[PDB]
Amino acid sequence: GDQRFGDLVFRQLAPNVWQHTSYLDMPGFGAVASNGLIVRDGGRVLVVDTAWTDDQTAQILNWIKQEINLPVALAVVTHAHQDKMGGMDALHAAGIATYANALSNQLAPQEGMVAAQHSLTFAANGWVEPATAPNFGPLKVFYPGPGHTSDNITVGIDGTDIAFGGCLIKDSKAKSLGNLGDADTEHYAASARAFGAAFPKASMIVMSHSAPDSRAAITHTARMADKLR
Ligand SMILES: COc1cc(C)cc2oc(=O)cc(CP(=O)(O)O)c12
Numbered sequence: 581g582d583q584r585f586g587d588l589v590f591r592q593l594a595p596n597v598w599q600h601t602s603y604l605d606m607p608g609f610g611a612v613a614s615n616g617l618i619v620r621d622g623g624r625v626l627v628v629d630t631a632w633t634d635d636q637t638a639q640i641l642n643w644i645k646q647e648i649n650l651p652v653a654l655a656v657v658t659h660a661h662q663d664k665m666g667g668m669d670a671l672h673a674a675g676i677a678t679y680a681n682a683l684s685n686q687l688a689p690q691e692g693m694v695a696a697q698h699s700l701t702f703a704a705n706g707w708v709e710p711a712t713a714p715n716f717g718p719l720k721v722f723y724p725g726p727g728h729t730s731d732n733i734t735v736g737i738d739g740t741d742i743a744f745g746g747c748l749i750k751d752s753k754a755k756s757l758g759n760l761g762d763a764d765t766e767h768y769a770a771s772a773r774a775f776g777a778a779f780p781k782a783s784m785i786v787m788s789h790s791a792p793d794s795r796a797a798i799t800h801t802a803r804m805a806d807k808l809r
């Protein structure tokens with residue numbers, strides 16, 4: 581079940597995979613939950629996305645120390661908004677190697693974010709160029725095209741049924757596509773479907789603002805995005 585740890589929530593999704601959840605009271609939008617992932621790969625831990633803030637991200641590291649007690653080898657962050665990169669300084673203070681889409685690192689300063697230390701680049705078909713993602717273990721990084729943002733990336737976990745859509749994917753009952761302020765509305769539907777096609781065996785879809793869902797999250801998100809065109 582859900583584990584409350586200070587102001588954060590942690591939920592085990594698989595033997596080696598947990599979801600981290602943090603909250604930011606955004607004036608005009610309530611207290612918004614954001615989810616990322618924690619993956620144990622043998623004797624090390626890999627993180628997908630920060631929490632909203634440095635303090636919350638340090639608390640993620642504290643939870644990892646108490647519940648897993650292995651070094652965090654790297655973190656990858658999935659676009660240049662605060663819910664995904666707001667805690668970069670906490671990762672750096674902890675000595676953790678950080679990775680983001682090159683475009684996310686380019687956008688970070690203007691978005692008020694600190695850039696990751698390393699830039700991922702992507703082949704024309706969307707798969708990460710492997711030399712830019714060394715030692716990623718089971719994390720398979722895919723750029724599906726522009727959607728929630730132009731830089732949004734996605735992550736599958738090899739050896740599990742889990743894929744992470746970040747803010748690109750909304751749950752199967754969602755009423756809207758959320759914050760479209762930086763979105764590519766023309767390309768969103770295709771990008772959502774490209775995420776599903778990249779991880780065809782993923783039956784558990786994890787996303788930024790809802791609990792994990794079935795693949796109906798992908799079909800429903802794409803069908804809603806069909807309207808934006
Ligand atoms: C940049 O961020 C946001 C901006 C605005 C105007 C509203 C928002 O409302 C949310 O609920 C979540 C976010 C972060 P997100 O776009 O999900 O990365 C958000």
Ligand SMILES: [Zn+2]
Nearest residue numbers: 659661728747
């Ligand atoms: Zn965003």
